Amino acid sequence: PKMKTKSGAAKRFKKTAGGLKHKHAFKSHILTKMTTKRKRQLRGTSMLNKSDVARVERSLRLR
Amino acid sequence: QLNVNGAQAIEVSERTFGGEFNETLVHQAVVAYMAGGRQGSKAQKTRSEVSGGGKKPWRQKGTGRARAGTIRSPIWRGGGTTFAAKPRSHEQKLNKKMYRAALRSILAELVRLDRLVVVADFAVDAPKTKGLVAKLDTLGLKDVLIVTDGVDENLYLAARNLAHVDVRDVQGSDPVSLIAYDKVLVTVSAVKKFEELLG
Amino acid sequence: ARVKRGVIARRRHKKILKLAKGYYGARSRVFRVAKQAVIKAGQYAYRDRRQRKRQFRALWIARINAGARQNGLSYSRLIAGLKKAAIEIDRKVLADLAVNEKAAFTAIVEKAKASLA
Amino acid sequence: QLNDLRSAPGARREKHRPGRGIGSGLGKTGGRGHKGLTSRSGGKVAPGFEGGQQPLHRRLPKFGFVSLKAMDRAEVRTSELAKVEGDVVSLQTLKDANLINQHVQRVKVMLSGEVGRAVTLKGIAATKGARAAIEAAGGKFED
RNA sequence: UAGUGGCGAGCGAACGGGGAUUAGCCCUUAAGCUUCAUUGAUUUUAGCGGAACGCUCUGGAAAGUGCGGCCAUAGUGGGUGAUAGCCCCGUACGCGAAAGGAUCUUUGAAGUGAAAUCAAGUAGGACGGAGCACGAGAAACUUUGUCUGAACAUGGGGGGACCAUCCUCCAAGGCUAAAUACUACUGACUGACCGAUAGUGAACCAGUACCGUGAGGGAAAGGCGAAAAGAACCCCGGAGAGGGGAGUGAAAUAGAACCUGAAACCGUAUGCGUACAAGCAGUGGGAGCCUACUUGUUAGGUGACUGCGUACCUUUUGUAUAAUGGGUCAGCGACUUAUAUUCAGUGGCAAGCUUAACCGUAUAGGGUAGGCGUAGCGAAAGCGAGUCUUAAUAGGGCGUU
RNA sequence: CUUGACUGCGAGACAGACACGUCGAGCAGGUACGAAAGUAGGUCUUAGUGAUCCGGUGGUUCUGUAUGGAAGGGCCAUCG
């Protein structure tokens, strides 16, 4: 070990065989304005798309 | 298979002797071997390490002169060298299998080029260089690497003065000394030991 | 492996200073001025391998103009009449016949006038 | 000969160097461009940094815990159970081969191939298909 | 990695393994360590011996050329008039100490260890701090500046708040070799280390000269020749300086400021062109003249005259720019290195691959601890060719020759 | 008259650097009205808003540093 992964990136981006999982923003603390249809569709654990991958796994020391 | 000067064949394996010559792997092994025998004993000094050089030489404006922060800058002739060396290592990793497979393809070329010579046993009597010269001159043999199964002290004391002869054991042989000497003398016990080691 | 670069720097400067010899002053004897003069000479020489083909053509055309007007014809009427006919003969050898072989040039301008252009 | 050997065409490369002349391809800048941060010495952009907006690793939430239960967990698939010696698959037996680390304690066997032999699995959990494929080809199971 | 962190920049374990090393003795008095006296032994501070070549060519000189040998536990050492195993000093290899020192070993002796007697102002606690990877945080454990304050082996503290139950140890007295760190200092050996602007600041009378009131800063400067054979004598000159000879030497345009002796810069000589001609000084055309040749449809040198023609850099939307930069020359002066990693190329092995420390008669071989791969899903328990969500065997996400 | 201003989702698109955002047939579970086809996942439409980290509150199948619990953490819903 001579490369330090960013610890805030490791709590945010868990790696699977399908990519790097993350959760969504906006499901915190203002949840009456939102419809159920918006709160239902930020609930899961999405993937991380192409524009973000190189930056995140450069932060998570994997590039 | 391989011929012995003592009138018989020895029937070697087609794996240790008589495989294809991987020129790339043998070249990697000889570059690795010549790297592992280099000592990195040098250093220069950087701009921190050359003596003195604390003050700015002049003030930065008014002097009409170019702009310096120390006498010992690497642009200056007193100053340091810019990417000054420190004692490093040049020893690289060759795999165990890659080593053994570069060996198996230079014993094969020592066979094909008629450069390998198998004898039944090679033993000198006395620690005399003249005796070992006479024993090699029967074989018509100058500039030879003698590989025995274990180096005897008589065979070691002779030929450690002799100019173009080297006496090694099987463990102590290397790709550079196999390719270097113009002929390679091995005993039958050395061919047994090479089949044990190399496969 | 420290390598001392003063033996190759010298030969490269000798090459540039040899290419610059014949020039005025520091153009021929100091490197930072000789180098620019050699590069500039090279640009002009590239440009002038083109303008050589431009300048010789104009001299041929001017000599053919002068030779044709002695026989009562322009340059342009001569070049038109030498294509109502078919001469395939160029400005170089027509200028050469304009100076040297004047009776042959007179024969050529009469065969251009014969085609009435 | 030491005089004669080279490597494969394409195995070493020349290591082109920046800053050696203008007819080399990398003069006067060395591939760095012109003024700005990423042409200076130490001209690095820090990892994650998006120019000053909130980067992805601070804009998305944190989502879970790591289990300390599973640091000593293990999985050994059915392709490997023929590789132990002695017709028994035990925890120490799976450590005698290098099939599983030291400091592992819990092994599940899952179905990823063919079990090969008739082995006995003491103290080792197995999935449904893997218990089926072990007991099919002569295996047994106790604890 | 777990944790930790304006949960930011970052900081960062442990359990469990693999090794290097090998020992525990005591407070009912010990190992050990010192200092002495002894018992043998080993090293060190100096040295001794140490093999084997002649003829010939070129040359100032032979080690080199040609030929023929010899030695070798000694053959790629140094220098000797050019390159030497055999010419010298050496080297491998054996020998060697009146006298000192040092390490180890006997076997006594005096000491010490040693604080007394199993630990009380101690454990614990309250405040305020510090440390433990841990920013007092659910905060254990350690330490304590203030204030307090226990039990006594059917005690006591630890197992990360805390509580029960188990497990494991006995704090408040001590002493302990090795593995470990470092090298101003010695000795040997080595270098894909430098070779006089380099390498130490410093090859030379260098921490000098010099600069500062001081602290402090800090240079420049190597080379005749193999041998001084370092120039007897004569001439000009001021019993000069410097030369012209003569001698020495292979060579003195190796003459002491001395190997080689570049460029900038400054001259003398010869050829040609230059005093009616306007500018980046060239370039295309081109007469004439002058030299060598041997002549011609050549080679070298000048270049009258003439067409075109506002350096280089750097910065910029753009520079001849009256924007920057450079007096010139010669030296020097800027993408390195380490460790982690990703991709490409190229090799070895292949459902496996690979070792790290370390061991090693040591680039071998050993050592597979560990790392990655053979399975994924889930935040996790877990379940697994599936899994998660879900009331759902539905949908959907991710995965599966 | 009444709660469809439902729960689980969600084929597929629009928008788009990313984070966000927009529309949505259909399926399951339960409901409004309507005799029944059917309409109903708020409002004619596009503004009315705010990331993360911290904390608070209610659940929970998860974890829970020897073990049984707790503490703290995780997920789900929600507030500042």
PDB file of C-alpha atoms (C1' of nucleotides) in Angstrom, chain E residues 9-184:
ATOM      1  C1'   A E   9      -7.455  17.922   2.789  1.00  0.00           C
ATOM      2  C1'   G E  10      -6.066  13.723   5.133  1.00  0.00           C
ATOM      3  C1'   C E  11      -4.407  10.391   8.961  1.00  0.00           C
ATOM      4  C1'   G E  12      -4.289   5.238   9.592  1.00  0.00           C
ATOM      5  C1'   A E  13      -4.603   0.005  12.793  1.00  0.00           C
ATOM      6  C1'   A E  14      -5.402  -4.680  14.914  1.00  0.00           C
ATOM      7  C1'   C E  15      -6.680 -10.029  14.833  1.00  0.00           C
ATOM      8  C1'   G E  16      -4.335 -13.678  12.092  1.00  0.00           C
ATOM      9  C1'   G E  17       0.083 -15.409   9.434  1.00  0.00           C
ATOM     10  C1'   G E  18       5.537 -15.767   7.361  1.00  0.00           C
ATOM     11  C1'   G E  19      10.231 -14.985   9.458  1.00  0.00           C
ATOM     12  C1'   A E  20      15.277 -12.822  11.931  1.00  0.00           C
ATOM     13  C1'   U E  21      16.541 -13.969  17.243  1.00  0.00           C
ATOM     14  C1'   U E  22      16.462 -17.394  21.592  1.00  0.00           C
ATOM     15  C1'   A E  23      17.259 -17.091  28.063  1.00  0.00           C
ATOM     16  C1'   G E  24      14.726 -15.911  31.812  1.00  0.00           C
ATOM     17  C1'   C E  25      16.227 -15.029  36.763  1.00  0.00           C
ATOM     18  C1'   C E  26      14.989 -12.567  41.802  1.00  0.00           C
ATOM     19  C1'   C E  27      12.922  -9.319  46.485  1.00  0.00           C
ATOM     20  C1'   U E  28      14.280 -16.377  52.228  1.00  0.00           C
ATOM     21  C1'   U E  29      18.839 -12.076  47.748  1.00  0.00           C
ATOM     22  C1'   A E  30      19.207 -14.814  41.446  1.00  0.00           C
ATOM     23  C1'   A E  31      20.907 -14.772  36.595  1.00  0.00           C
ATOM     24  C1'   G E  32      23.725 -11.283  34.641  1.00  0.00           C
ATOM     25  C1'   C E  33      27.391  -7.443  34.600  1.00  0.00           C
ATOM     26  C1'   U E  34      31.950  -5.080  36.336  1.00  0.00           C
ATOM     27  C1'   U E  35      36.990  -5.015  38.373  1.00  0.00           C
ATOM     28  C1'   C E  36      41.122  -8.042  39.702  1.00  0.00           C
ATOM     29  C1'   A E  37      44.200 -12.647  39.737  1.00  0.00           C
ATOM     30  C1'   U E  38      44.636 -16.680  36.853  1.00  0.00           C
ATOM     31  C1'   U E  39      43.507 -21.135  32.411  1.00  0.00           C
ATOM     32  C1'   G E  40      44.562 -22.305  27.668  1.00  0.00           C
ATOM     33  C1'   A E  41      43.384 -20.443  22.858  1.00  0.00           C
ATOM     34  C1'   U E  42      42.469 -16.801  18.850  1.00  0.00           C
ATOM     35  C1'   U E  43      43.261 -12.297  16.485  1.00  0.00           C
ATOM     36  C1'   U E  44      45.713  -7.400  15.743  1.00  0.00           C
ATOM     37  C1'   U E  45      49.779  -3.675  15.818  1.00  0.00           C
ATOM     38  C1'   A E  46      56.071  -5.046  11.306  1.00  0.00           C
ATOM     39  C1'   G E  47      57.590  -8.330   8.205  1.00  0.00           C
ATOM     40  C1'   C E  48      59.909 -12.779   5.442  1.00  0.00           C
ATOM     41  C1'   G E  49      59.880 -15.952   1.082  1.00  0.00           C
ATOM     42  C1'   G E  50      57.167 -15.922  -3.351  1.00  0.00           C
ATOM     43  C1'   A E  51      57.352 -19.317 -10.497  1.00  0.00           C
ATOM     44  C1'   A E  52      58.455 -18.556 -15.469  1.00  0.00           C
ATOM     45  C1'   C E  53      61.464 -15.020 -22.235  1.00  0.00           C
ATOM     46  C1'   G E  54      64.672 -15.346 -25.774  1.00  0.00           C
ATOM     47  C1'   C E  55      65.784 -14.014 -31.093  1.00  0.00           C
ATOM     48  C1'   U E  56      63.940 -10.536 -34.797  1.00  0.00           C
ATOM     49  C1'   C E  57      61.478  -5.928 -37.609  1.00  0.00           C
ATOM     50  C1'   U E  58      60.009  -0.685 -37.171  1.00  0.00           C
ATOM     51  C1'   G E  59      61.364   2.909 -33.684  1.00  0.00           C
ATOM     52  C1'   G E  60      64.070   8.119 -29.797  1.00  0.00           C
ATOM     53  C1'   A E  61      62.731   4.072 -26.576  1.00  0.00           C
ATOM     54  C1'   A E  62      59.508  -2.163 -27.433  1.00  0.00           C
ATOM     55  C1'   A E  63      55.644  -4.126 -23.522  1.00  0.00           C
ATOM     56  C1'   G E  64      54.031  -3.670 -29.921  1.00  0.00           C
ATOM     57  C1'   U E  65      55.311  -6.782 -35.188  1.00  0.00           C
ATOM     58  C1'   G E  66      57.135 -12.034 -37.005  1.00  0.00           C
ATOM     59  C1'   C E  67      58.859 -16.871 -34.761  1.00  0.00           C
ATOM     60  C1'   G E  68      59.755 -20.258 -30.958  1.00  0.00           C
ATOM     61  C1'   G E  69      59.169 -21.256 -25.766  1.00  0.00           C
ATOM     62  C1'   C E  70      58.197 -21.481 -20.279  1.00  0.00           C
ATOM     63  C1'   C E  71      55.326 -20.780 -15.545  1.00  0.00           C
ATOM     64  C1'   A E  72      50.318 -20.865 -13.122  1.00  0.00           C
ATOM     65  C1'   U E  73      46.606 -22.610  -5.737  1.00  0.00           C
ATOM     66  C1'   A E  74      50.315 -16.644  -9.456  1.00  0.00           C
ATOM     67  C1'   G E  75      46.548 -14.263 -16.600  1.00  0.00           C
ATOM     68  C1'   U E  76      42.515  -8.547 -17.616  1.00  0.00           C
ATOM     69  C1'   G E  77      47.105  -5.181 -10.561  1.00  0.00           C
ATOM     70  C1'   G E  78      50.611  -0.949 -10.597  1.00  0.00           C
ATOM     71  C1'   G E  79      55.038   1.398 -13.920  1.00  0.00           C
ATOM     72  C1'   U E  80      59.079   0.320 -16.609  1.00  0.00           C
ATOM     73  C1'   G E  81      61.235   5.628 -22.713  1.00  0.00           C
ATOM     74  C1'   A E  82      54.646   2.749 -26.990  1.00  0.00           C
ATOM     75  C1'   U E  83      50.393  -2.168 -25.251  1.00  0.00           C
ATOM     76  C1'   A E  84      54.572  -7.150 -20.315  1.00  0.00           C
ATOM     77  C1'   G E  85      51.790 -13.570 -16.518  1.00  0.00           C
ATOM     78  C1'   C E  86      57.799 -14.512 -17.495  1.00  0.00           C
ATOM     79  C1'   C E  87      61.906  -6.482 -16.432  1.00  0.00           C
ATOM     80  C1'   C E  88      60.819  -4.399 -11.305  1.00  0.00           C
ATOM     81  C1'   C E  89      57.155  -3.846  -7.023  1.00  0.00           C
ATOM     82  C1'   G E  90      53.776  -7.196  -6.416  1.00  0.00           C
ATOM     83  C1'   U E  91      49.775 -11.477  -6.702  1.00  0.00           C
ATOM     84  C1'   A E  92      47.997 -16.869  -5.515  1.00  0.00           C
ATOM     85  C1'   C E  93      50.337 -19.570  -1.874  1.00  0.00           C
ATOM     86  C1'   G E  94      52.918 -20.792   2.598  1.00  0.00           C
ATOM     87  C1'   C E  95      55.794 -18.787   7.026  1.00  0.00           C
ATOM     88  C1'   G E  96      56.102 -14.849  11.062  1.00  0.00           C
ATOM     89  C1'   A E  97      56.257 -11.391  16.946  1.00  0.00           C
ATOM     90  C1'   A E  98      60.998  -9.178  22.524  1.00  0.00           C
ATOM     91  C1'   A E  99      56.841  -6.468  23.405  1.00  0.00           C
ATOM     92  C1'   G E 100      51.645  -4.075  23.761  1.00  0.00           C
ATOM     93  C1'   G E 101      46.268  -4.154  22.757  1.00  0.00           C
ATOM     94  C1'   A E 102      41.359  -6.659  21.800  1.00  0.00           C
ATOM     95  C1'   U E 103      37.683 -10.872  21.698  1.00  0.00           C
ATOM     96  C1'   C E 104      36.380 -15.705  23.598  1.00  0.00           C
ATOM     97  C1'   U E 105      37.242 -19.470  27.280  1.00  0.00           C
ATOM     98  C1'   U E 106      38.408 -21.746  32.479  1.00  0.00           C
ATOM     99  C1'   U E 107      38.281 -20.798  38.306  1.00  0.00           C
ATOM    100  C1'   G E 108      38.467 -18.257  42.175  1.00  0.00           C
ATOM    101  C1'   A E 109      37.890 -13.276  44.623  1.00  0.00           C
ATOM    102  C1'   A E 110      35.686  -8.569  45.932  1.00  0.00           C
ATOM    103  C1'   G E 111      31.733  -5.827  44.418  1.00  0.00           C
ATOM    104  C1'   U E 112      27.261  -4.761  42.153  1.00  0.00           C
ATOM    105  C1'   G E 113      22.380  -5.945  40.448  1.00  0.00           C
ATOM    106  C1'   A E 114      19.522  -4.523  45.497  1.00  0.00           C
ATOM    107  C1'   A E 115      14.594  -1.759  45.739  1.00  0.00           C
ATOM    108  C1'   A E 116      13.719  -5.139  51.093  1.00  0.00           C
ATOM    109  C1'   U E 117       9.995  -8.897  52.781  1.00  0.00           C
ATOM    110  C1'   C E 118       5.085  -9.445  46.545  1.00  0.00           C
ATOM    111  C1'   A E 119       4.063  -3.391  46.558  1.00  0.00           C
ATOM    112  C1'   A E 120      -1.625   2.592  49.153  1.00  0.00           C
ATOM    113  C1'   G E 121      -1.990   8.297  48.715  1.00  0.00           C
ATOM    114  C1'   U E 122      -1.606   3.092  44.842  1.00  0.00           C
ATOM    115  C1'   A E 123      -6.274   1.154  41.615  1.00  0.00           C
ATOM    116  C1'   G E 124     -10.650   3.688  40.769  1.00  0.00           C
ATOM    117  C1'   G E 125     -13.455   8.467  40.341  1.00  0.00           C
ATOM    118  C1'   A E 126     -14.789  14.282  39.420  1.00  0.00           C
ATOM    119  C1'   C E 127     -12.984  18.415  36.669  1.00  0.00           C
ATOM    120  C1'   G E 128      -8.862  20.404  32.831  1.00  0.00           C
ATOM    121  C1'   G E 129      -5.431  18.294  29.302  1.00  0.00           C
ATOM    122  C1'   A E 130      -2.366  14.740  26.602  1.00  0.00           C
ATOM    123  C1'   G E 131      -1.999   9.974  24.089  1.00  0.00           C
ATOM    124  C1'   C E 132      -3.804   5.768  21.904  1.00  0.00           C
ATOM    125  C1'   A E 133      -4.634   5.500  13.783  1.00  0.00           C
ATOM    126  C1'   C E 134      -9.325   7.383  17.245  1.00  0.00           C
ATOM    127  C1'   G E 135     -10.724  16.151  16.066  1.00  0.00           C
ATOM    128  C1'   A E 136     -14.263  13.579  23.983  1.00  0.00           C
ATOM    129  C1'   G E 137     -17.165  11.271  20.252  1.00  0.00           C
ATOM    130  C1'   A E 138     -21.534   5.584  22.355  1.00  0.00           C
ATOM    131  C1'   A E 139     -15.506   6.209  24.122  1.00  0.00           C
ATOM    132  C1'   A E 140     -13.000   1.697  26.217  1.00  0.00           C
ATOM    133  C1'   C E 141      -7.458   1.342  27.568  1.00  0.00           C
ATOM    134  C1'   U E 142      -3.040   4.454  29.113  1.00  0.00           C
ATOM    135  C1'   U E 143      -0.981   9.051  31.635  1.00  0.00           C
ATOM    136  C1'   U E 144      -1.856  13.214  35.059  1.00  0.00           C
ATOM    137  C1'   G E 145      -2.124  19.299  36.623  1.00  0.00           C
ATOM    138  C1'   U E 146      -6.081  20.100  40.596  1.00  0.00           C
ATOM    139  C1'   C E 147      -9.410  17.538  44.192  1.00  0.00           C
ATOM    140  C1'   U E 148     -10.499  12.991  46.225  1.00  0.00           C
ATOM    141  C1'   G E 149      -9.968   7.894  47.166  1.00  0.00           C
ATOM    142  C1'   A E 150     -10.429   1.354  47.657  1.00  0.00           C
ATOM    143  C1'   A E 151     -10.701  -4.363  48.042  1.00  0.00           C
ATOM    144  C1'   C E 152      -7.078  -7.739  50.155  1.00  0.00           C
ATOM    145  C1'   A E 153      -7.106 -14.850  46.463  1.00  0.00           C
ATOM    146  C1'   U E 154     -14.660 -17.065  48.738  1.00  0.00           C
ATOM    147  C1'   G E 155      -9.485 -10.167  46.284  1.00  0.00           C
ATOM    148  C1'   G E 156      -8.420  -7.411  42.099  1.00  0.00           C
ATOM    149  C1'   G E 157      -8.168  -5.601  36.196  1.00  0.00           C
ATOM    150  C1'   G E 158      -8.917  -6.696  31.237  1.00  0.00           C
ATOM    151  C1'   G E 159     -11.837  -8.601  27.019  1.00  0.00           C
ATOM    152  C1'   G E 160     -13.645  -0.620  22.983  1.00  0.00           C
ATOM    153  C1'   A E 161     -19.901   2.845  26.575  1.00  0.00           C
ATOM    154  C1'   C E 162     -22.372  -0.112  30.085  1.00  0.00           C
ATOM    155  C1'   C E 163     -24.439  -4.887  32.698  1.00  0.00           C
ATOM    156  C1'   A E 164     -24.626 -10.053  33.776  1.00  0.00           C
ATOM    157  C1'   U E 165     -22.151 -14.896  32.661  1.00  0.00           C
ATOM    158  C1'   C E 166     -17.720 -17.057  31.106  1.00  0.00           C
ATOM    159  C1'   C E 167     -12.521 -16.719  29.511  1.00  0.00           C
ATOM    160  C1'   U E 168      -7.852 -14.858  30.761  1.00  0.00           C
ATOM    161  C1'   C E 169      -4.194 -12.570  33.731  1.00  0.00           C
ATOM    162  C1'   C E 170      -1.865 -10.557  39.280  1.00  0.00           C
ATOM    163  C1'   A E 171      -0.611  -3.580  38.666  1.00  0.00           C
ATOM    164  C1'   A E 172       1.168  -0.188  42.195  1.00  0.00           C
ATOM    165  C1'   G E 173       9.564  -3.580  43.392  1.00  0.00           C
ATOM    166  C1'   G E 174      13.295  -4.979  40.077  1.00  0.00           C
ATOM    167  C1'   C E 175      17.454  -6.753  36.616  1.00  0.00           C
ATOM    168  C1'   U E 176      18.207  -8.977  31.748  1.00  0.00           C
ATOM    169  C1'   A E 177      22.081 -11.230  25.989  1.00  0.00           C
ATOM    170  C1'   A E 178      20.581 -11.596  20.448  1.00  0.00           C
ATOM    171  C1'   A E 179      18.028 -10.101  16.292  1.00  0.00           C
ATOM    172  C1'   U E 180      17.733  -3.484  15.677  1.00  0.00           C
ATOM    173  C1'   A E 181      19.822   1.778  14.587  1.00  0.00           C
ATOM    174  C1'   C E 182      24.017   4.808  13.231  1.00  0.00           C
ATOM    175  C1'   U E 183      29.431   5.947  11.229  1.00  0.00           C
ATOM    176  C1'   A E 184      32.822  11.865  12.363  1.00  0.00           C
TER     177        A E 184
END
